[PDB]
Nucleic acid binder design. Structure first.
Lengths: 136, 122, 217, 54
RNA sequence: GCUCAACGGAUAAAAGGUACUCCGGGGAUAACAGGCUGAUACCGCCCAAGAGUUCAUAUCGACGGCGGUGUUUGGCACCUCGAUGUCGGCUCAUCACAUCCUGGGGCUGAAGUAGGUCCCAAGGGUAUGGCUGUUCGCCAUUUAAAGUGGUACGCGAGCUG
RNA sequence: CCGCCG
RNA sequence: CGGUGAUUGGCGCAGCCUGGUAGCGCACUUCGUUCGGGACGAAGGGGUCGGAGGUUCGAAUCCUCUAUCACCGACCA
């Protein structure tokens, strides 16, 4: 569960999730799991996909998570009326736009990278795809 | 017509003196129990030298009723009091070794033949 | 002797509990011998010890024979239990057993929890909301799951402290004769060392290895 | 009379017991008292074998 | 010269109870029930780490993921405050199928008996008592089985209280 | 005045 | 649940509130008294203040949450 050590403010606004992504290229490794769909990605989902990728590649090659959560999601307790403040910071998500390369790996064959990324993307809410790095 | 919460006298010498029917066995929602009918009973009274004690739950079969049996010619044999023979709780064999009072022809089957050999009349 | 053995072995004698004697001696002591193979060595110390000497606290010089019981357990300090959820936590929500409010007229708040391990069943019914009954029923789930954990720890350790506590004189090992002829003898392995001072300075290693070598056969 | 400690033990064994005497340390089958060989007073006036005087 | 700080400051000077209560109003505003939603709850499915002697997928299924139902606890206050009578029992029911029984199947870690799980199927059936106001639950003894829900948590111009 | 125990 | 008030030596409490400056009693250690033990004297040690993070030159102390503990309220239908 990745989470910001010593963040500035405790809570933050909801906001929107518009636009396309920024890190749209495989830059560190050679095989990448990219996002076709929008949505949020919790730290639990990110650690679950990372555990699937590590257990699939059996601790070979390098693994890059190209997203950190850094957005506090609050939640109101239940049997509690509306108003009377703001809910407690319960989990942390990372906003994900289409085209965001979520994961990267290197040092693994391509078909085993495809299987590791399939086992990853089974555990994520958003639609993904497998992209390869390219020169220029 | 033995139903539940019905007190019965005891025909054999098994030690009980008055029992109470708590369950008419065999068939859901069953109201009554005729003569050749197994019931579940509790022992509400016993003799001190009995094989069974007061407050035990075991099995019995009726041998006499006041409502009485009806023969195929239309005859009816009404006794004076409802009596029962205390059987075993699982093997359905009588506890005692003797039988007081008469029984009917409706105890003609192998288990109740073991009963009916010991009976004085039929 | 036991601290001079533990520190020569390199172990750590922590001395959890202690109680002095009135004139001389001790009245009770409970040690913690931090070591790798600590209980594997100190299995050989279970049972009473016999000391035959002349008491310096005497005046007549009577031979004083003395008996000190030694109970030595292995410690755990495990405390490793978090949840149970891999089985079926069979829960139930029902109207609580109460009057004097709108609980009997309107809604159900009470929570029963049933476990397949050892049939732990817990009721929480008195907090005006079903959700806090689930949360406090989880707290009183752990508040007896940890208790039964201590019950099973204690039930194992009671078998440990009652393994061989029925033999008559065979529970008496380690006669430390000082006054007439000065020999230490073990009464289960039949070995003996005639220099009792080197034994009392902590060289019970031969008496432990002979014990394990006998109980291995 | 049974002691107040034993009455508290009985109440706590009826009400969700543990039987703490199992967790008591088991005494040996013999007696562990202090054995002292006799003094010169005791041996000098023990009067054994009671042989008459001449 | 005012913590006239309830800070555009009614007076220089002021706390409570009311189930003994009363009036004027409000569905502008709560309790019940309906509505909207579905966090929660329940039911189902996706991935498969692992358990299952071997073997992910007979049976389970972690980390996580996606739905359905309206079905628990809720959220909101849309209907009703010129009145929509609550819980439980009795009597009488009717529908759903996410089937307890009977009926038909596939797989089985299915020898047989008896099971486990899933698929099809709603024609009929689906206890009596002890305790408690209890629904529920526990217990006793049965039963082929003692189904889960909807119906103003069915049913007081039908009864009880 | 105070002076318990073995 | 929140509201409200505490965690200081091995124990029970101070000190906190006012920012620099941790002590009381028991207990412990050594010596003395005594045949010895207690009692009593005489010397001596004892904690970096629940945890973490900020204020400030500086925090046991001022705030901020997190843990633990105890009290109070958790209502009307």
């Amino acid at each position: 569960m990745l989470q910001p050590k010593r963040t500035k403010f405790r809570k933050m606004h909801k906001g929107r999730n518009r636009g396309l992504a920024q890190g749209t290229d495989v830059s560190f490794g050679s095989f990448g799991l990219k996002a076709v769909g929008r949505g949020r990605l919790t730290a639990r989902q990110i650690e679950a996909a990372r555990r699937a990728m590590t257990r699939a590649v059996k601790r070979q090659g390098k693994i890059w998570i190209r997203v950190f959560p850094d957005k506090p999601i609050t939640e109101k307790p239940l049997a509690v009326r509306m108003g009377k403040g703001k809910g407690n910071v319960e989990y942390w998500v990372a906003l994900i736009q289409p085209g965001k390369v979520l994961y990267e790996m290197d040092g693994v064959p391509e078909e085993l990278a495809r299987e590791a990324f399939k086992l990853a993307a089974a555990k994520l809410p958003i639609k993904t795809t497998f992209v390869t790095k390219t020169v220029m | 017509m033995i139903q539940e919460q019905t007190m019965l006298n005891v025909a054999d010498n098994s030690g009980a003196r008055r029992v109470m029917c708590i369950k008419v066995l065999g068939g859901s929602h069953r109201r009554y129990a005729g003569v050749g009918d197994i019931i579940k009973i509790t022992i509400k009274e016993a003799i001190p030298r009995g094989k069974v004690k007061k407050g035990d739950v075991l099995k019995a079969v009726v041998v006499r009723t006041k409502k009485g049996v009806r023969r195929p010619d239309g005859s009816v044999i009404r006794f004076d009091g409802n009596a029962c023979v205390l059987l075993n709780n699982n093997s359905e064999q009588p506890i005692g070794t003797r039988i007081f009072g008469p029984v009917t022809r409706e105890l003609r089957s192998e288990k109740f033949m073991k009963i009916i050999s010991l009976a004085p009349e039929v | 002797m036991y601290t001079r053995w533990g520190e020569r072995r390199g172990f750590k004698v922590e001395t959890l509990d202690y109680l002095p004697g009135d004139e001389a001696g001790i009245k009770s002591v409970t040690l913690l011998i931090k070591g790798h193979n600590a209980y594997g060595y100190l299995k050989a110390e279970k049972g009473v010890h016999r000391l035959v000497r002349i008491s310096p606290f005497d005046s007549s010089g009577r031979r004083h024979t003395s008996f000190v019981s030694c109970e030595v357990m292995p410690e755990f300090n495990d405390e490793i239990d978090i949840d149970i959820r891999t089985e079926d936590i069979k829960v139930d929500t029902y109207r609580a057993s109460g009057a004097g409010g709108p609980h009997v007229n309107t809604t159900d708040s009470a929570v029963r929890i049933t476990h397949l391990p050892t049939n732990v069943v817990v009721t929480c019914q008195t907090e005006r909301s079903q959700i806090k009954n689930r949360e406090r029923a989880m707290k009183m789930l752990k508040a007896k799951l940890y208790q039964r954990r201590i019950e099973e720890q204690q039930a194992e350790l009671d078998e440990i402290r009652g393994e061989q506590k029925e033999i008559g004189w065979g529970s008496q090992i380690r006669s430390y004769v000082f006054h007439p002829y000065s020999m230490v003898k073990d009464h289960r392995t039949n070995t003996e060392m005639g220099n009792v001072q080197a034994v009392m300075d902590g060289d019970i290693d031969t008496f432990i290895d002979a014990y394990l070598r006998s109980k291995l056969s | 009379a049974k002691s107040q400690a034993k009455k508290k033990r009985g109440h706590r064994l009826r009400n969700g017991g543990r039987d703490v005497l199992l967790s008591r340390g088991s005494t040996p089958s013999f007696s562990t008292h202090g054995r002292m060989t006799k003094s010169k007073k005791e041996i000098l006036n023990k009067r054994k074998h009671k042989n008459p005087y001449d």
